[PDB]
Design a protein around this ligand. Structure first.
Ligand SMILES: NC(=S)Nc1ccc(F)cc1
Ligand SMILES: O=C(O)CNC(=O)C(=O)O
Ligand code: NI
Ligand SMILES: [Zn+2]
Length: 331
């Protein structure tokens, strides 16, 4: 078996290899990349997402989110407080202000130490889940707005035609902005391109060990666990690498820099933080290997998770027994 230790693998496709997206995902998996839950893909030197990022300041962040923490440094939740709208130019200025800017640091490891020591004592503001794309329409390779849709994948594999669409989202981040431990909706893949700015550090649990993370989360957030059998779907819980190590949870970490893609694989739990002002673009996708994960995906039915329109069809077709209860939490 390839990659038995479930290490995060890094790929350097040639421009020829970068033509066929599906084929290269399949190649990565033939080398065992999915066992880690996360892979890095460095694009060919000849490739670019767009010409410049000089004219993005007028993009609107309609609902910036202030991420307010509760708990202890290594085990905490965050809730999202809605703030007034601001443009990307205004947001960048805020990110670079004395209150919010990245502190002096020696290297990525030093900054990581500072993040886990001090994150809970600050409330950074995130521009998340903004529908849109920064890929040039003439970019033909690995354009996240031009991927085959999940609905067409389900139709190709299972013969059922369903409603729904599948478009990218933009994320504008600043120092300490945080993404909580989660897998994707319906345990789908995700792909994330860091367009511009400071790095993003990722943590990931191998899919074959996801239930170990779930068990620890139930122990560490006992009230949340009683309230919902799938509360990590709420995307609000953080557990530090130190606490994961103390509890013997297998995981890996890696830092993504501007110009690099990350792919998360079905049922690969991940979490992380931004180093400073940046912009990422991400979208979910599927392959034939995903279908069995979609059939088995846990669901939140307590009402907190609240998902896109398009997940309805996924649950309806792949999980018909669960559909009645799930839809109740969504109305
Ligand atoms: N490459 C960068 S950081 N360009 C940029 C970012 C924000 C903005 F408002 C205008 C331009
Ligand atoms: O970048 C972020 O804030 C979160 N991204 C993801 O969880 C992802 O791409 O799957
Ligand atoms: Ni994700
Ligand atoms: Zn729930």
């Amino acid at each position: 078996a390839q990659n038995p230790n479930c290490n995060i693998m890094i790929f350097h496709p040639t421009k020829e290899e970068f033509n066929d997206f599906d084929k290269y995902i399949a190649y990565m998996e033939s080398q065992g990349a999915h066992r880690a839950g996360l892979a890095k893909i460095i694009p060919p030197k000849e490739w670019k997402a767009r010409e410049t990022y000089d004219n993005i300041s007028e993009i609107l962040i309609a609902t910036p989110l202030q991420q307010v923490a509760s708990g202890r440094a290594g085990v905490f939740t965050q809730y999202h407080k809605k703030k007034k709208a601001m443009t990307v130019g205004e947001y960048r200025h805020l990110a670079n202000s004395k209150k919010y800017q990245t502190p002096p640091h020696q290297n990525f490891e030093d900054l990581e130490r500072k993040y886990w020591k001090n994150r809970i004592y600050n409330s950074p503001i995130y521009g998340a889940d903004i529908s849109g794309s920064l890929f040039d329409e003439n970019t033909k390779q690995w354009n996240l707005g031009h991927l085959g849709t999940i609905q067409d994948l389900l139709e190709k594999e299972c013969g059922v035609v369903i409603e729904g669409v599948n478009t990218p989202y933009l994320y504008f981040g600043m120092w300490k902005t945080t993404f909580a431990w989660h897998t994707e909706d319906m345990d789908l893949y995700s792909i994330n391109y860091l367009h511009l700015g400071e790095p993003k550090t990722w943590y990931v649990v191998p899919p074959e060990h996801g239930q170990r993370l779930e068990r620890l989360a139930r122990e560490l957030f006992p009230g949340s666990s009683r309230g919902c059998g799938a509360f990590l779907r709420h995307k609000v819980a953080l557990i530090s690498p130190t606490v994961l190590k103390e509890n013997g949870i297998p995981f890996n970490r890696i830092t993504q820099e501007a110009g690099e893609f990350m792919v998360t694989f079905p049922y690969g739990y991940h979490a992380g933080f931004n180093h400073g002002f940046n912009c990422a673009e991400a979208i979910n996708f599927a392959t034939p290997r995903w279908i069995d994960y979609g059939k088995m995906a846990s669901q939140c039915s307590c009402g907190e998770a609240r998902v896109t329109f398009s997940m309805d069809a996924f649950v309806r077709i792949l999980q018909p027994e669960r559909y009645d209860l799930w839809k109740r939490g969504q109305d």
